[PDB]
Amino acid sequence: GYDRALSIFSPDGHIFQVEYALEAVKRGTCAVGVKGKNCVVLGCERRSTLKLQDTRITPSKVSKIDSHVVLSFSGLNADSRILIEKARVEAQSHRLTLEDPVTVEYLTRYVAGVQQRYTQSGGVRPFGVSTLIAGFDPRDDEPKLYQTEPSGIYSSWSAQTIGRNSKTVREFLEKNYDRKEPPATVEECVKLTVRSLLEVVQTGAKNIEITVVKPDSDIVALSSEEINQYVTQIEQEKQE
Amino acid sequence: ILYGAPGTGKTLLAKAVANQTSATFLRIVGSELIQKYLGDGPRLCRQIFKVAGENAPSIVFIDEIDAIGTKRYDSNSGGEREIQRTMLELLNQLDGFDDRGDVKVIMATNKIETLDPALIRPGRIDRKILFENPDLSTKKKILGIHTSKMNLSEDVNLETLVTTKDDLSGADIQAMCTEAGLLALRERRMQVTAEDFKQAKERVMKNKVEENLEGLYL
Amino acid sequence: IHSRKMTTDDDINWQELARSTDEFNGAQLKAVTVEAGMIALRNGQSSVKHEDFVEGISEVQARKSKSVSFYA
Amino acid sequence: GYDRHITIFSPEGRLYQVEYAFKATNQTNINSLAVRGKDCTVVISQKKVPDKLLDPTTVSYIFCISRTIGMVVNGPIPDARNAALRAKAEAAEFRYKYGYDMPCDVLAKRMANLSQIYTQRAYMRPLGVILTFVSVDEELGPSIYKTDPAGYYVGYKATATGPKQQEITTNLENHFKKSKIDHINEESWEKVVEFAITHMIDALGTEFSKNDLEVGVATKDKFFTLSAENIEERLVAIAEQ
Amino acid sequence: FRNNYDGDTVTFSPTGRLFQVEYALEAIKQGSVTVGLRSNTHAVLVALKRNADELSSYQKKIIKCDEHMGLSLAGLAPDARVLSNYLRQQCNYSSLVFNRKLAVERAGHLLCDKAQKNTQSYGGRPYGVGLLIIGYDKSGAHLLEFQPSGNVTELYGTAIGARSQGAKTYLERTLDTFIKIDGNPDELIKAGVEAISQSLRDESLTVDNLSIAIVGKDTPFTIYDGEAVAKYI
Amino acid sequence: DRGVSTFSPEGRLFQVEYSLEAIKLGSTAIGIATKEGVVLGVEKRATSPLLESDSIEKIVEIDRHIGCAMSGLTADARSMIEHARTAAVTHNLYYDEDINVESLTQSVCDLALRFGEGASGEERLMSRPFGVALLIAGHDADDGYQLFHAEPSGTFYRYNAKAIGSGSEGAQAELLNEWHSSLTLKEAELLVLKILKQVMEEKLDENNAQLSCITKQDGFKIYDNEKTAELIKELKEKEAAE
Amino acid sequence: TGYDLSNSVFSPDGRNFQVEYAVKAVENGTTSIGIKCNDGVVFAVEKLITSKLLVPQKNVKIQVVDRHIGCVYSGLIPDGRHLVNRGREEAASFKKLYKTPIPIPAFADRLGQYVQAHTLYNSVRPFGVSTIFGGVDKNGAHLYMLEPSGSYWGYKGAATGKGRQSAKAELEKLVDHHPEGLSAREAVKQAAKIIYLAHEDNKEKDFELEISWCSLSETNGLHKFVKGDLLQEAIDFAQKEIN
Amino acid sequence: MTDRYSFSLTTFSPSGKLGQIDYALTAVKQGVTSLGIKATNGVVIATEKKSSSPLAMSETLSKVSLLTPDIGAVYSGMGPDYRVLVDKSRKVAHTSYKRIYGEYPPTKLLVSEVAKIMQEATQSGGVRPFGVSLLIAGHDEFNGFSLYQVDPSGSYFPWKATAIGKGSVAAKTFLEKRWNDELELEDAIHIALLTLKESVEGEFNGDTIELAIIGDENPDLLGYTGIPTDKGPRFRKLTSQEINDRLEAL
Amino acid sequence: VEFSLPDLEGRANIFRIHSKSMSVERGIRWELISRLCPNSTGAELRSVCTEAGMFAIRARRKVATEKDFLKAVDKVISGYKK
């Protein structure tokens, strides 16, 4: 039908190629994150069940863009690495010109433009990978969480999930998280984030990777024993 | 409208309702509606509602339609010319049939995209049930039926068997327990114990599905 | 021939109005004369005057209806 | 079918586009003869006679590339005139960069490789005409190089173009076995035209007039085409023998 | 027709006439109707302005090109903009190089060669907008009729758009009238109002939908609207 | 070739016609151009309460006295928004003056009326066809307050009251009556909220509804959530008495 | 078959259908003839009158090449002018390098390679028009007609269009009238009569006679249009013969 | 529908292997039977030439060309496909090597560069790769004697004895039949004549048979004397008159 | 005679007639929910009135509120898209 062409708008108003790109996201890994008052937390799922795989030489799913800005996504990694490289070059180009650290709003508009330009270019395949750009604005503690979609649009969310079983985790994000009063403490935002991941991970440790961003350009990576500690506290309420 | 496979989706759902409704199960093969003779299409459809049109102590059930559900554009490529005029008379018999719901017409096929928009008639059929992948709670209800007869060890509960479940809804839980009871016959015992559960489930979950759905696309 | 059978005022030019017709057979021209009388009912006329033929013959009838006055 | 519209390989290895290239060469039904003498080379092409509304002087199947070099083409006209423009351009450019005459061995090679360049272009259509190059080489002497529309060229003792080419080759083959030479006698270039036309009439089986033929002559450091009065003068000398 | 012959602009037909051009002409038939006529000393163009709804304002179909020249655009909107800037560039190029205003017969040759390049080239969409161009040069007043194929024909006056036959019938019987009127620009405009009146089906009879432009040996090309064109109405 | 071949041509172009349905799938935006100002409004279309309405904005400011709105895909809009902002600073560069609303709209439509890679007498930028529904409104020293709808298909038209989005069809039916030449600035603010509340799928609230005004004194000003909520209570008080 | 959907593709008949359709499209156009005399050539074109709104000396299809060559074609009007406008640049390009006017056989080679290459290009649509050009160069009078297929030869007379069948029979009679050919003034009266004879199929519409010629006798190698008493004499001469 | 006959120009073959290569190998199978024999002291190649018309000059067709004096080559397939390939292949050896290292290209570098042109023809769309298969034989100081079979798919492998063309499958066993790796060059030419004779029995003479050898340098083909350092050409093309001498001694 | 899709005015006149036979709330407004649905066939319009009562049974209401018609239209939009 209309999957052979791109610029054709189709009578349904939506290109079927973008919908088929969402199907790869439906089978993609689960990426969950929630931003609090003083901090933002981004979790991810990297399957360690594959045998004969060294975790030391395995690159992490969370890609460092700026000091106070990280990047998380779900989808084909071959398509994301291009988006990662184009974002990192522009990330350095921000200080190469404006001398200011990378702005979350400016970085998202660029990545959306990268999704836009390669889509508007004939004979160029668009990226069907959804990326989550989070971080704090320069000289600002207000959390900023943006997303990217294969349709070429961006939006902001307090709590958002992508990948496999995105609708199931989304129901967990609306009911158990209050935008009017986000969690103030760091432990509460991380512990509730693990509970959303335990649905798709189903009682696992090395399959969960969480990178917490702190003000004044601080990146911390929770170890395997630290992530498993939140799993034990959640299991205490289920067995009670 | 139902979706699924015979024995689970297109079978268990049809026979379970006739039990609670206290209605006689009436099965009509979808291929029998078209006899490859002109005039048998409208004749056999009117006779179905005639048996159930007196006291109406039954419900009409039709399963596994690969033929009359698709008329195509012609008498080739799986369709037939007699199917075009048969589905139209079934519409007149569906609208002309009026009761309080003692008799229902349940038809299940693979795809409804080839059906006649006339026979669809929105508002006569408000129900479209698509086959879904059950969760882990579904297996606990199927195990409880067979575990009432076959005795299980005290070290293995309903939570132990439900641990490994890969793309099986309701049909092969009985088939998996069949091998679990067959392996115990090799050890000469009538009660499956903890040593038998481990060796039996490995012979089941393995060496069955050749195609692998995996996240190594990376 | 269709105009001589129907009642007219003999003010109609059959050669000039036929310039708007394109690729019409003998049967398709019969529907054109029927549309000419339908315009008289829309204009509130008992008979069919010359202005009714000009509007119905120039408009394409029994072939294709082009409603597009704008881009696409 | 789509497989017959593509220039690339076919399932059986027989290109349908190339089969139409040789088929279009016989569309005009022109029978030309190219033979090699001793010191000279004479090529005669069949001249179709139209009505009185066409100028026979302008109508020609033979184009002059340069001195001593000449070409006869049998096939589609629109591809015949454009192919002559490419051979003339490469002839002058080769006499400048390399500063030496362009022999028919190379002159048939450039157009042969140029036809493969046209096959590599999707928008450009290859030449469907036969390019027959004749000249007198300084070393090899008389040489005939006939370039097929598919870019095939090889030297010939005697060659022709048409449906009677099989009858022309057979008639000229037995004649060359008696004298055991591929060159025509009577080294004088005026008499070479007599035999080249004589062996053509016996091969074709039909006598032609002055307007039915166009006689090209390639001599040493000179090339010219006989006019209507010169061709008529040849027919008078051929009639007496 | 569906596919087969005349499916592409390059693709020909068994008859030899490309039907893709006729498809571009179909947009002119139901487009904005315009009527025009010229004399030796004057030229007049009367164009109908269209609208979406009552809240939608009427847009002028007459676009200014040269001080002594004018044109009306009936057809596809995006195709008419490129040809507009092309004629604007040729008028300035002729004034920058040849110092003379672009001639009418010269404007038609450049406009014909402009749309012909995109027609013979594979791909692209040819121009389907009609252009009626008037101008006053040393040769006098001239009126060109530009068809979507690129054909150029000189006439005293013509009309395109919805029900263009109504004005053509008026111009045939009155052909000997407006050509003899000289030095009277008012009588030539009154003939244009009565010409479009027979063409119109009486959708909107108001003043705002009619745009009358006139050029002559004394008064240059000027677009009138509102109370300026309401005097003749 | 599906939609570019199989069709029986009437002399139409089906490339943009498929985008006409995508225009109706965009956000509903309604605005009215009066003599005392231009009141504009859009719809946020929040499918979940976690969406940030203050972070995303469906209206852009091209000039101090000229606003803009969008209904459609944001991807195709960003190319037109950056092109509209480029033409705004272009007139501020060469002529150093605020460009007119009609003059700016025609410059923005120059990109919307051209498509394709290859060309002859005009440069090209976008490599594939696109489209977006843009409502350009503002104020100048020539024609005063003006409102133009920017259509990638045809030429823009002058609308005093224009409605776009899914509710564009039924809202224009209400604009043929309630709209009047004597509507003031305060009456125009309450008239849009009365029409917007009906055409919008969700309930009227400060979060899912964002309106803005265009005047000469204040230029382009966006109604704050607190100021918008005050106008919402005035609409509910008027509907309660009727 | 699908050979017409792709340009520059060999057909089973040996010639592309699009090239064959371009030749048949010339017959749908107006009839244009020509006569090649000893001291020059004479061109005659027929133009069908659409309506009384047409102004004479406006739509004339006579095209010019340098000062010594006239040009006329038959086919699509917009397609023919683009070929002439390019030939005008070809005659000027030769004038820049060689500082001399272009001869007729050289003018055919430039337009020949121009049209024949387009028939070999898919991205360029072939021409559906047949151009007739001629004049007097330094080498004398020459006449050539460029067919839409790309083939051209020297012609003692030119015939094309719809009435080419009735015109070809009259052009062959020029040998019967005089063995040496008619003069410059006699060819104008003779070429006009052929237009009326070829007008029997076009008799449902009117016409405007347009004749142009270039010779060394009167015009002294200049392209001019027939006017004055010479134009009216050729009209009355043919009207008396058709009686 | 069926496949569009792709080289992987714009489209990968759904069958897992390119189908037109076998159709390009059909054009290779369409070629004449051409064989070669790699021995210790030399490498010999043999091929047959098409007669076509009886009046066609046999000296015009050369199926064994000269790239470098130490390296020979022989091909089977369409005529113009080999000329366009080598005309470009020569300029590659000149610029990439002879204009840098200023010497004669060795066997490893020259054969690799020839296959790169076929790789570019498969990668670049719209340009069909040429369907000729080349057997390149050469002798250098580094690797010594070498015999490589260049396939149109872009792959080459060394072969002691191999055949291409219509007899590619048939003569490959025939070469292994009468010849073994332990045999020298002198006994290899007799085997090459007996195997090639089985291809066509019509004319075995030097007119339709082009035979070439690679071996010790010949000072007559060097063109100059006085320099002991520069080695003579290791490739010597056998004249048709000299080919008949090997036929009588066969 | 070709059957086309009715407009918003056609859908409003059909819903008000069916609302007399089926029990509905006195405060519902059909000028809104019907506007949210695009042009649909006359057969699907009767389905909206029948499916509206199905969600009311799940919601346990004697009549069909405004939220009941919304779920019935969304069921038609997701399963048809006409």
Side-chain angles (χ1 to χ4, degrees), chain A residues 27-28 50 75-77 81, chain B residues 136 213-218:
Chain A
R27 292 192 298 273
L50 179 63
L76 178 63
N77 292 337
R81 290 193 297 273
Chain B
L136 296 175
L213 177 63
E214 186 67 15
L216 266 63
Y217 63 92
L218 192 145

Side-chain angles (χ1 to χ4, degrees), chain G residues 66 86-97 100 102:
Chain G
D66 290 344
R86 179 60 178 165
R88 293 180 180 174
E89 294 177 351
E90 295 301 321
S93 296
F94 178 83
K95 184 178 179 180
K96 293 176 179 177
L97 296 175
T100 186
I102 182 169

Side-chain angles (χ1 to χ4, degrees), chain A residues 1-2 4 6-15 35 105 109 112-113 115-116 119-123 143-146 151-160 170 173-174 177-179, chain F residues 1-5 14-22 25 47-56 73-82 85 117 125-131 207:
Chain A
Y2 295 94
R4 65 180 182 87
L6 191 148
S7 64
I8 303 301
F9 296 95
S10 178
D12 290 344
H14 182 62
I15 296 99
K35 62 182 179 181
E105 183 178 2
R109 291 177 63 85
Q115 182 66 261
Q116 184 175 355
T119 301
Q120 292 174 334
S121 178
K144 301 299 182 181
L145 176 61
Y146 296 140
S151 296
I153 63 172
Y154 63 91
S155 63
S156 180
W157 292 92
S158 296
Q160 185 63 59
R170 181 177 64 84
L173 296 175
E174 294 177 351
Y177 295 91
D178 187 5
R179 180 179 178 172
Chain F
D1 290 343
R2 182 61 183 86
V4 296
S5 178
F14 295 93
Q15 294 178 336
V16 178
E17 183 177 1
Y18 296 143
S19 178
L20 296 175
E21 296 301 321
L25 295 175
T47 59
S48 178
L50 296 175
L51 178 64
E52 294 180 350
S53 63
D54 291 344
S55 296
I56 61 172
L73 178 64
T74 302
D76 291 344
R78 292 192 297 273
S79 296
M80 295 300 294
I81 293 171
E82 295 301 321
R85 293 181 181 174
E117 294 178 350
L125 179 63
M126 295 295 103
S127 178
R128 66 180 182 88
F130 60 91
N207 290 283

Side-chain angles (χ1 to χ4, degrees), chain H residues 221-232:
Chain H
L221 296 175
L222 179 61
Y224 62 91
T225 58
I227 296 171
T229 299
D230 290 344
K231 294 177 179 177

